[PDB]
Design a protein around this ligand. Structure first.
Ligand SMILES: *[C@@H]1O[C@H](CO)[C@@H](O)[C@H](O)[C@H]1NC(C)=O
Ligand SMILES: *[C@@H]1O[C@H](CO)[C@@H](O)[C@H](O)[C@H]1NC(C)=O
Ligand SMILES: *[C@@H]1O[C@H](CO)[C@@H](O)[C@H](O)[C@H]1NC(C)=O
Lengths: 10, 100, 276, 289
């Protein structure tokens, strides 16, 4: 299952 | 940005037998950026209903795609894969070789 | 044996040619099992190997929801990249992402990975300790500052130690009879003259899984790794792989040459020779 | 098959401005015709074949409309491709501007939601909310009518950096729906969190009077490139770059000034090239004169 990174930007 | 030209390989899924169903593959790899045009050709004519795998890439970030179609080889018919890419000034034709 | 799970993201801007596009694929070892493409009519995470198709709707809806959010995030990351490098809004650019985990035969984590690229070059990478970053340039140093202040490594680490390994173990069990059963290569040697005094010997390996393989030519037992032509391992289309190795030999000296093949699916390594 | 039509640099364009329509088809940008929505197969300008991108400049209200293109396909029943995606050119500056406000306010914690309310004493049939930028599509809502004003509530969220930035709204009237008012005054919508909050402090301290000095220091172990000092009331959005000190903290000292009046202060850190993304707020501080 894929990684869930809510709200993380470069 | 630095750009990278595709490597190409044209081959069948199984050992080719005249008059037997098979799959004709054109494997493009090592290229960047990702936009690329790949055609399978039969007697110089573009084959309709060629499929390709989903875009992915290698550890060095260069992309790779497999294009493929179902085909019944005959002695008379000549297959090739045509590839065009920003790094390529003109399209590149790689012929299928049953003798390799 | 040991195994791996990987997700690869490709986000691309293409001004004037389409809307920004997000492509995600998931792999267990050499076997792709999911895809998401934002250019589809109704984007969804979709099965690409038969052994994931019997996962319930809660799985697909969770994956799709996350992929839509990631597509939105990386569309914004393409814009942020333009400002960090002072590039025009007219050009086309590409962000690439990889993350995943390697497990041992006991199913426990051996290491985690997370790396980012921009326009084909290393951008930023999570170090082996899974708690610190390595930045490739001053633009990427901006992202590193932000990710430190937001403690993004702790989030990667929590995924790499937990869900990543638990799901990989679940997937390997789901696809046990194709993921954990090495298919050995079918081999043969062919011969073609290049003149009246030399000839090509080509050693072939077909139909094997997984892709890792060693093809080597020896002449009287000495490795010819300098005079050997090796072709990149290539997919057959049915989840097996193909490869060959070729060496040029003086006519009449063919019997001095042996091709050696090593693969997980072979109980012992094979020595082959060309037979007229 | 289907070309890709696009407007550059923006489909929402002021009168007197400029926008170009490109029609990308068969790896080329030339030889195409244009079509407005109502006359679905009456090509515009008496069937003009645009041999390159079509630059509308200066934009007039007559440029406003809902467009498709067709690329030249010289071996086919009609000799032209299928219709493209539709691009709507919206021309602004044709009515008095409406007003835009945020409820509860323009600083939105990451993951939360905010309502942007557009309203006017003019009876606008629709309202458009547009985030400033390149190739940004507007949101439309019909205007409710009540108390002698028309108004619309745009819900924005879950807040991420993509939803942050400078927003404007616009009204349109019944019979010219692609003709937009002048833009509302702009609203900066800032996302806060999850970057760690800095510390606020005063030098020499939070109590002062007369022509004496009062400097506020915003400080953090995290490597913020800038700080933002914010006193309740909205009359100070003061921003200063950070300096790294020997102890490895990042700091900026804000000298208040000769007529400081005081109030409750907070500060936020932010990073280079991202002015709409702020850290969590520091604990509050009250200064007294
Ligand atoms: C523009 O016209 C297209 C048909 O070409 C239609 O699908 C779309 O809803 C129209 N958009 C607006 C804003 O009227
Ligand atoms: C819009 O939001 C405001 C403020 O949050 C609220 O008072 C109002 O009821 C909402 N709806 C309309 C139609 O104004
Ligand atoms: C670090 O040093 C600066 C310079 O005087 C000072 O203002 C700040 O309070 C110090 N912070 C810490 C945590 O020691």
């Amino acid at each position: 299952a894929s990684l869930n990174l809510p709200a993380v930007s470069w | 940005m630095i750009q990278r030209t595709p490597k190409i390989q044209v081959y069948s899924r199984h050992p080719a037998e005249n008059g037997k169903s098979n799959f004709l593959n054109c494997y493009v790899s090592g290229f960047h950026p990702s936009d690329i045009e790949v055609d399978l050709l039969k007697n110089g004519e573009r084959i309709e209903k060629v499929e390709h795998s989903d875009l992915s890439f290698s550890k060095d970030w260069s992309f790779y795609l497999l294009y493929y179609t179902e085909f019944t080889p005959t002695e008379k018919d000549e297959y090739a894969c045509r590839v065009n890419h920003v790094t390529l000034s003109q399209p590149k034709i790689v012929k299928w070789d049953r003798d390799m | 044996g040991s195994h791996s799970m990987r997700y690869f993201y490709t986000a691309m801007s293409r001004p004037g040619r389409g809307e920004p596009r997000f492509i995600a694929v998931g792999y267990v070892d050499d076997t792709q099992f999911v895809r998401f493409d934002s250019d589809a009519a109704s984007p969804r995470m979709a099965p690409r190997a038969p052994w994931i198709e019997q996962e319930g709707p809660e799985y697909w809806d969770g994956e799709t929801r996350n992929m839509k959010a990631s597509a939105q995030t990386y569309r914004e990351n393409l814009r942020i990249a333009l400002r960090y490098y002072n590039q025009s809004e007219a050009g086309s650019h590409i962000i690439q992402v990889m993350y995943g985990c390697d497990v041992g035969p006991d199913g426990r984590l051996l290491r985690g990975h997370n790396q980012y690229a921009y326009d084909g070059k290393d951008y930023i990478a999570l170090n082996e300790d899974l708690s610190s970053w390595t930045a490739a340039d001053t633009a990427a140093q901006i992202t590193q500052r932000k990710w430190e202040a937001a403690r993004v490594a702790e989030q990667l680490r929590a995924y790499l130690e937990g869900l990543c390994v638990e799901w990989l173990r679940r997937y390997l069990e789901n696809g046990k009879e194709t993921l954990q059963r090495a298919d050995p290569p079918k081999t043969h040697v062919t011969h073609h003259p290049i003149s009246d005094h030399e000839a090509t010997l080509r050693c072939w390996a077909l139909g094997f899984y997984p892709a890792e393989i060693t093809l080597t030519w020896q002449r009287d037992g000495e490795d010819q790794t300098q005079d050997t032509e090796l072709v990149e391992t290539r997919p057959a289309g049915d989840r097996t792989f193909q490869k060959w190795a070729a060496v040029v030999v003086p006519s009449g000296e063919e019997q001095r040459y042996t091709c050696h093949v090593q693969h997980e699916g072979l109980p012992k390594p094979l020595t082959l020779r060309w037979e007229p | 098959d289907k070309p890709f039509l696009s407007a550059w640099p923006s489909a929402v364009v002021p009168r007197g401005g400029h926008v170009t329509l490109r029609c990308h088809y068969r790896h080329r940008f030339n030889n195409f015709m244009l079509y407005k929505e109502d006359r679905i197969h009456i090509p515009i300008f008496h069937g003009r074949i645009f041999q390159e991108s079509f630059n509308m400049s200066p934009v007039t209200t007559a440029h406003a409309g809902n467009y498709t293109c067709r690329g030249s396909h010289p071996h086919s029943p009609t000799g032209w491709s299928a219709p493209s995606n539709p691009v709507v050119i919206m021309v602004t500056g044709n009515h008095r501007k409406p007003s835009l406000l945020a409820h509860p306010g323009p600083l939105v914690k990451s993951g939360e939601r905010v309502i942007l309310q557009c309203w006017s004493d003019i009876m606008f049939e629709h309202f458009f909310l547009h985030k400033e930028g390149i190739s940004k599509d507007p949101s439309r809502l019909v205007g409710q009518i009540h108390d002698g004003v028309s108004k619309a509530n745009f819900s924005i969220g879950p807040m991420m950096l993509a939803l942050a930035g400078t927003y404007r709204c616009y009204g349109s009237v019944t019979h010219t729906p692609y003709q937009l008012s002048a833009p509302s005054d702009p609203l900066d919508i800032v996302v806060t969190g999850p970057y760690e909050k800095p510390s606020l402090s005063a030098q020499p301290g939070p109590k002062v009077q007369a022509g004496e000095s009062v400097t506020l220091s915003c400080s953090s172990r995290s490597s913020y490139d800038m700080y933002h000092l914010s006193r309740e009331g909205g009359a100070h959005e003061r921003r200063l770059p950070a300096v790294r000190k020997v102890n490895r903290t990042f700091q900026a000292d804000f000298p208040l000034g000769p007529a400081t009046h005081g109030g409750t202060y907070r500060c936020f850190g932010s990073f280079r090239h991202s002015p709409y993304e702020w850290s969590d707020p520091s604990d509050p501080l009250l200064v007294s004169v």
